[PDB]
Design a protein around this ligand. Sequence first.
Ligand SMILES: */C=C\S(=O)(=O)Oc1ccccc1
Length: 282
Amino acid sequence: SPYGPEARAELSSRLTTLRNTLAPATNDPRYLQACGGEKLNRFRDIQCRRQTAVRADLNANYIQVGNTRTIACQYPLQSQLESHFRMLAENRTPVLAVLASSSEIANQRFGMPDYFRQSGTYGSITVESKMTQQVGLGDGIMADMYTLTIREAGQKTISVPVVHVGNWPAQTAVSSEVTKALASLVDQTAETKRNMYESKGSSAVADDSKLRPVIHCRAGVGRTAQLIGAMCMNDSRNSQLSVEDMVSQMRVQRNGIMVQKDEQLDVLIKLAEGQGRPLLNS
Ligand SMILES: */C=C\S(=O)(=O)Oc1ccccc1
């Protein structure tokens, strides 16, 4: 059985060993380190792959599942904000998927600045949050969208489409139905903006590491990984890409925690099933 419990068990199995072998060790060469002082990882057990690191001072990586390339990162710390904004800008960010909950954000204890819903200045950078549309995704899950405008002297103004999912509690998985609706919208959005830079004759088209959708929850590995996997199978070029690959790739590109929970794997496993996509690798 392709999706038989034995099958699923072998997957989780391989995936477990991988999560284990990828666990960051003190001063792990495979991961980006905190520069003499300032905390770099929101969670000091959920680190960033140095190989793929986007910025020397951000827990964020360049991930490529098959032909699908994006950027997964943690929720920026107060300090990271400026460099965060800098990245999204340079990346010519086509879409910014934020899967962390409004509950998590409002929670000052959590150190998650409402960096994208409100307008503010973070140094030489001034941000304008423009709330655009709201779209239900099912099960009562909502997609709140804003247009982030990053302005900076000498730098090019760059508005970034933002897709926020408020009611997606952390450490959980949403209806494969929902999970699916979202991927589409996230892709939809990224498509519209991307096409705009293409039309404007932009140059971030030639550069591969650019025009990358950015996704992140809090630690950028659970809810985030789910979306990515979702967005992956949603790319009509990843034919034959296994679930095994999706998870084993994201984890080598960011950290072994990718696809944190099980109910998260399950969804991907379910989305993959309906597509007749292989779970394990032969
Ligand atoms: C992006 C990860 S998450 O979905 O926010 O889940 C968490 C993982 C570790 C610690 C807190 C939250």
